[PDB]
Ligand binder design. Structure first.
Ligand SMILES: CNC(=O)c1ccccc1Oc1nc(Nc2cc(OC)c(OC)c(OC)c2)ncc1Br
Length: 243
């Protein structure tokens, strides 16, 4: 409708819908987050969202969805962002299976560097969830920002909760299944609070020591960004442009 033709609805968020936008001349596809101004005013997060968008504009990380422009109308806010073609990562895992060891390490390094970048450059937060991790045309991980615009850890905390989530995403990459999964809801939290997760034969021992630390119950005893950056398995074939 504006600037870019508006097509099919991708999803429906809290502040409003998110649709696809094709270019009227070139055919370039973008993702438009439509945020309702009245809904923002009713939620008393006017300054919170305005400062979040200002912080997202100065964001420059290739494994995070970039914000191009924000068009303002008296009814809604139009966040023009990059369209990630291949949907969610976890959608690919359950449909295809497990990813190879050196390929899962490639995706993990892209995910962790992005998570760390978000915590040191964002005012407001939502805990990271496998919903945020998306896959592009080049099969690279693209993470959505932890803001108001868009199986929890044991145990307010920000990076500590996300490191545990990175451990869940890491497990799913070289296993195909989740580290903790049970049909019964009370026993699911019991496995998490106990840190009991199955370790497969095909899994390496160096990554097993990293996974054990990342999925630690006590957040004080749990691995930090520096702890993972100093680990042998994570350091192997890690690109210099990150961190
Ligand atoms: C509907 N989109 C969302 O809910 C969404 C959530 C977090 C971050 C960005 C989001 O929207 C975005 N989603 C894409 N790629 C994308 C591609 C999809 O394939 C149709 C897709 O549905 C399978 C999809 O929703 C699952 C997203 N890229 C940028 C944004 Br911006």
């Amino acid at each position: 409708i504006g600037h870019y033709v508006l097509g099919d609805t991708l999803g429906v968020g809290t502040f409003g819908k998110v649709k696809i936008g094709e270019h009227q001349l070139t055919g370039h596809k973008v993702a438009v987050k439509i945020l309702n101004r009245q809904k923002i005013r009713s939620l008393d997060v006017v300054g919170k969202i305005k400062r979040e968008i200002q912080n997202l504009k100065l964001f420059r990380h290739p494994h995070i969805i970039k914000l191009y422009q924000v068009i303002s109308t008296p009814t809604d806010f139009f966040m023009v962002m990059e369209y990630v073609s291949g949907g969610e990562l976890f959608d690919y895992i359950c449909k295809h299976g497990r990813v190879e060891e050196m390929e899962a390490r490639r995706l993990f390094q892209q995910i962790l560097s992005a998570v760390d970048y978000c915590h040191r450059h964002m005012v407001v937060h939502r805990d990271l969830k496998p919903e945020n991790v998306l896959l592009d045309a080049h099969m690279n991980a693209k993470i959505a920002d932890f803001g108001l615009s868009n199986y929890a850890a044991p145990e307010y905390a920000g990076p500590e909760v996300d490191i545990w989530s990175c451990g869940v995403i890491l497990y799913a990459l070289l296993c195909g299944t989740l580290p903790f999964d049970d049909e019964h809801v009370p026993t699911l939290f019991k496995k998490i609070r106990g840190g009991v997760f199955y370790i497969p034969e095909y899994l390496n021992r160096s990554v097993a020591t990293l996974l054990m630390h990342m999925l630690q119950v006590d957040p004080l005893k749990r691995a930090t960004i520096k702890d993972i950056r100093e680990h042998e398995w994570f350091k192997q074939d890690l690109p210099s442009y990150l961190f």
